[PDB]
Design a protein around this ligand. Structure first.
Ligand SMILES: *[C@@H]1O[C@H](CO)[C@@H](O[C@@H]2O[C@H](CO)[C@@H](O[C@@H]3O[C@H](CO[C@H]4O[C@H](CO)[C@@H](O)[C@H](O[C@H]5O[C@H](CO)[C@@H](O)[C@H](O)[C@@H]5O[C@H]5O[C@H](CO)[C@@H](O)[C@H](O)[C@@H]5O)[C@@H]4O)[C@@H](O)[C@H](O[C@H]4O[C@H](CO)[C@@H](O)[C@H](O)[C@@H]4O[C@H]4O[C@H](CO)[C@@H](O)[C@H](O)[C@@H]4O)[C@@H]3O)[C@H](O)[C@H]2NC(C)=O)[C@H](O)[C@H]1NC(C)=O
Ligand SMILES: O=C(c1cc(OCC2CCOCC2)nc(C2CC2)c1)N1CC[C@@H]2CN(C(=O)N3CCc4c(O)noc4C3)C[C@@H]2CC1
Ligand SMILES: [Ca+2]
Ligand SMILES: [Cl-]
Ligand SMILES: [K+]
Ligand code: NA
Ligand SMILES: [Zn+2]
Length: 804
């Protein structure tokens, strides 16, 4: 209810939203059915089109016109965008050579370059190249400004999660918009595209850019447009606000285009009907730039051209049906499509069982086009678990596919040829980024990056301090000519101890046994290895900093260095370099079940073999792999109890293959590698290092905590003609966070040889170094010759394993 009796005279696209029941004249009024009676007439004028003509030139103003071609239009700020071109012999912005914008070239009384954020729904990354012929305005922004070959969306790659990630710099799990569709069990409410509930404020967490701006005294232009306001009118309105007096003019503006997503759904990402929507978007950008140029603002404003996700080929026939797997189909609720989320239809049904549902959904058909997960077992890179709105059971759907509950759903609810929502590493889900203006670099291509990063940069562009977020601030400094953010390294909280030899062998009663009984040339030599004489070789980038309060030791050895935790009874990290020439050897049998006391570490701070013997499910592995020891004598070090970690037999198959085969392979392909491995404990799946009291599982009868995951960080020279250990320039990294699981149900091929499936598993759980920092509270690459910004970029890098 509004007294829709009031008027919109001199209120058209008012910047503050007014309190019902007085009627509203803002760009959002329709979506709340609250516009004044006269809104359409006053604010949505259409008369005479969107363009001047030779004969409308110098005309007498007629207020009914959509836009003006009279002399005064300029001062008034309401000409058609093509006025100067038609009436004053000016050229279109697209037809001008580009010229470096070294400084903001702004009208007097602008305190900062304005930022215009132009967002295009479903604009797949490859459109920049594949549609380059029909998008000349966008092509000029791209090639003249700063661009990435693509931008990585967040999962799920849907419109609401991604737009709200752009606004906030947060993962969906933190900002709370975890899908286009959602059930919040605490509110007992549902969120849907259709309806009122989505307008309620309790859905939207974090602090979006417009709120950050207001709180800090930067005026923001209402970001949101009622769907039936046509594009031309959005543009003109923005150009209007830009002519406002200094004290009322917004500094930041948003345009949203429903295209090309809307057509891409109907016709597929590359349907022949896709050319026109791309031409129309380019024309809109052309109108913006021509209008900016008319106001002499085209070398003053920073423009960001950004998509929320791409678009994949998806059809009705590529549907998997849960009713083909589950006998109990009507006792579950499915959130369907390009992802699945399952819960109990009724939480009074105590006979519902997630374990049995997971099992009936696992590896059932030879080419199953979805894989079920407990949310906490999803790839950590997705950051999709720590929200009560995310169901315990998740289905990751193959690209090109849909999951539905029953066939009735798919034909009693083909229509569509395109969809999106899949895993965010999927090529067809990648979207765009272009930045153009005084603050962005000129003719510069930057590497791909993730959209969680942009919030920080839009804050930089506006001189705002960002609210706490998931971007890594400074990792996108290389996009910017100035306004860079110069972060310092987090300070180390705990300093390590460096223990010497303090214990006698016979003080250890651990049930551990080792067959190990054997000069001065090589007795001084082992001692210097233990003092750290090869640390320079195996610790290339400094030791990681521990960013929390704890008690740990640095342990030096011939082949590897480790930071051993006295609290968790194992290393936090283990570091070693494997050169291109290194050789794999086997574990001798006088050594197979050997575990040796470490005479630098008390019995009390050590694991014991007995607990592994008692624990019928749990076994153990090693962080530094004995396969890769440098000499028979060094190989004993690999068997120290301080190199030992708890491992399920199922997981050891994974680990042994990685250590025995893949590490050498990466050293061959990359010209040496540096490896840092270690355990992760994330029992509450928040993406953050657990404290000791969060640990849910210990090796039977002991205090040895069981990791949920195992990481490795594999670094080399980007220029691979130099060995990892003598690298003159930038670095190259890949990492993983492997789930530590008692079975291999995740890999449907796992009863075959590891060469068939282990590597694919690792690819799926590829990670950013930054993900591993959050999960461990360590800070890596402390001592390089590289700039800190270049290091933040490296730490945010993700090796996706998709082709070109
Ligand atoms: C991505 O970046 C983000 C942003 O930096 C990171 O998320 C932050 O992580 C912090 C560490 O976990 C977290 O800090 C906690 O905040 C609690 C108070 O928080 C409120 O106020 C803030 C500030 O404005 C607000 O933003 C929060 O908003 C959340 O809550 C509502 C949902 O109800 C949503 O609208 C919103 O979307 C957001 O939800 C998300 O966050 C929460 C956790 O805050 C999740 O549970 C949700 O699922 C969702 O993901 C809040 O309204 C504060 O109480 C916490 O402190 C407890 O724990 C410590 C123990 O050491 C103690 O010091 C405190 O006293 C307190 O303990 C007591 O209560 C305990 C819990 O109730 C209880 O167990 C004890 O017995 C104690 O008595 C804590 O400081 C911060 O809020 C979020 N922020 C956001 C926006 O998400 C994120 O980690 C990054 N991700 C990665 C991978 O890096
Ligand atoms: O005004 C907006 C809009 C803008 C915007 O910007 C944020 C900027 C942040 C700064 O940086 C850049 C962005 N944030 C939001 C919300 C996140 C706050 C909304 N919208 C877009 C969304 C909905 C979907 N839509 C629809 O039909 N689809 C429903 C969902 C969907 C899907 O997933 N595929 O097709 C569809 C079709 C109707 C409505 C259109 C108008
Ligand atoms: Ca945790
Ligand atoms: Cl969804
Ligand atoms: K065992
Ligand atoms: Na399997
Ligand atoms: Zn869509």
């Amino acid at each position: 209810w509004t007294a829709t009796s009031g008027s919109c005279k001199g209120r058209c696209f008012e910047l503050q939203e007014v309190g019902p029941p007085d009627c509203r004249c803002d760009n959002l009024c329709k979506s709340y059915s609250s516009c004044c009676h006269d809104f359409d007439e006053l604010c949505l004028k259409t008369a005479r089109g969107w363009e001047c003509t030779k004969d409308r030139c110098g005309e007498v103003r007629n207020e009914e016109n959509a836009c003006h071609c009279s002399e005064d239009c300029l001062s008034r700020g309401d000409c058609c965008t093509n006025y100067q071109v038609v009436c004053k012999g000016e050229s279109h912005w697209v037809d001008d050579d580009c010229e470096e914008i070294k400084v903001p070239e702004c009208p007097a009384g602008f305190v900062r370059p304005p930022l215009i954020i132009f967002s295009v729904d479903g604009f797949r990354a490859s459109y920049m190249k594949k549609g380059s012929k029909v998008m000349p305005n966008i092509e000029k922004l791209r090639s003249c400004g700063t661009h990435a070959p693509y931008m990585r969306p967040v999962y799920p790659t849907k419109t609401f999660p991604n737009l709200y990630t752009l606004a906030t710099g947060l993962y969906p799990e933190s900002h709370g918009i975890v899908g286009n569709s959602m059930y919040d069990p605490v509110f007992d409410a549902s969120f849907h595209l259709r309806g009122r509930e989505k307008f309620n404020h309790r859905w939207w967490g974090g602090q979006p850019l417009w709120i950050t701006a207001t709180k800090q005294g930067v005026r923001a232009g209402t970001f949101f447009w009622s769907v039936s306001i046509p594009h031309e009118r959005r543009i003109l309105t923005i150009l209007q606000w830009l002519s406002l007096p200094d004290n009322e003019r917004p500094s930041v503006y948003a345009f949203y285009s429903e295209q090309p997503d809307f057509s891409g759904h109907k016709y597929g990402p590359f349907g022949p009907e896709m050319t026109n929507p791309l031409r129309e978007i380019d024309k809109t950008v052309g109108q913006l730039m021509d209008g900016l140029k008319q106001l002499r603002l085209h070398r003053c404003v920073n423009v960001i051209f950004v998509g929320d996700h791409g678009m994949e080929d998806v059809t009705c026939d590529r549907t998997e049906f849960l009713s083909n797997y589950l006998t109990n189909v009507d006792d579950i609720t499915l959130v369907p499509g390009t992802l699945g989320r399952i819960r109990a239809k009724s939480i009074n049904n105590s006979k519902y069982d997630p374990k049995t549902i997971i099992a009936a959904l696992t590896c059932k058909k030879p080419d199953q086009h979805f894989k079920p997960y407990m949310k906490q077992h999803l790839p950590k890179r997705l950051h999709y678990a720590n929200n009560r709105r995310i169901e315990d059971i998740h289905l990751l759907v193959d690209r090109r596919w849909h999951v539905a509950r029953k066939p009735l759903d798919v034909y009693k609810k083909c229509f569509f040829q395109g969809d999106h929502g899949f895993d965010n590493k999927v090529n067809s889900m990648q979207t765009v980024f272009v930045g153009y203006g005084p603050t962005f670099k000129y003719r510069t291509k930057v590497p791909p990056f993730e959209n969680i990063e942009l919030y920080n940069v839009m804050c930089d562009l506006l001189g705002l301090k960002p609210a706490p977020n998931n971007g890594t601030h400074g990792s996108l400094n290389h996009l910017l000519r100035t306004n860079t953010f110069r972060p310092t390294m987090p300070d180390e909280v705990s300093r390590p101890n460096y223990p010497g030899i303090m214990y006698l062998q016979s003080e250890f009663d651990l049930g551990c046994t080792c067959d190990d009984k054997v000069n001065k040339l090589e007795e001084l030599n082992k001692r210097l290895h233990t003092k750290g004489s090869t640390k320079e070789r195996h610790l290339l980038y400094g030791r990681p900093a521990v960013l929390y309060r704890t008690s740990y030791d640095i342990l030096y050895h011939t082949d590897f260095e480790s930071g051993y935790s006295e609290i968790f009874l194992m290393p936090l990290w283990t570091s070693y370099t494997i050169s291109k020439q290194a050789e794999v050897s086997s574990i001798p049998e006088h050594l197979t079940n050997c575990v040796r006391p470490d005479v630098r570490v008390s019995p009390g701070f050590s694991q014991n073999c007995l607990a592994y013997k008692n624990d019928k499910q749990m076994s153990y592995g090693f962080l530094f792999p004995p396969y890769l020891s440098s000499s028979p004598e060094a190989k004993y070090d690999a068997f120290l109890v301080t190199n030992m970690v708890p491992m399920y037999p199922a997981f050891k198959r994974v680990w042994a293959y990685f250590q025995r085969v893949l590490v050498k392979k990466y050293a061959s392909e990359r010209n040496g590698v540096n490896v840092i491995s270690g355990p992760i404990f994330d029992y509450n799946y928040d993406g953050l290092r657990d404290t000791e009291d969060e640990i849910k599982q210990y090796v039977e009868g002991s205090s040895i905590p069981v990791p949920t995951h195992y990481y490795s960080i594999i670094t080399s020279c980007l220029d691979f003609t130099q060995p990892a250990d003598k690298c003159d320039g930038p670095l190259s990294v890949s990492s993983f966070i492997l789930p530590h699981r008692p079975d291999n149900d995740e890999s449907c091929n796992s009863s075959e040889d590891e060469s068939k499936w282990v590597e694919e598993l690792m690819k799926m759980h590829t990670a950013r170094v930054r993900d591993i920092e959050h999960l461990t509270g360590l800070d890596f690459y402390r001592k390089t010759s590289r700039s800190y910004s270049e290091i933040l970029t490296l730490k945010t890098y993700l090796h996706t394993y998709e082709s070109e």
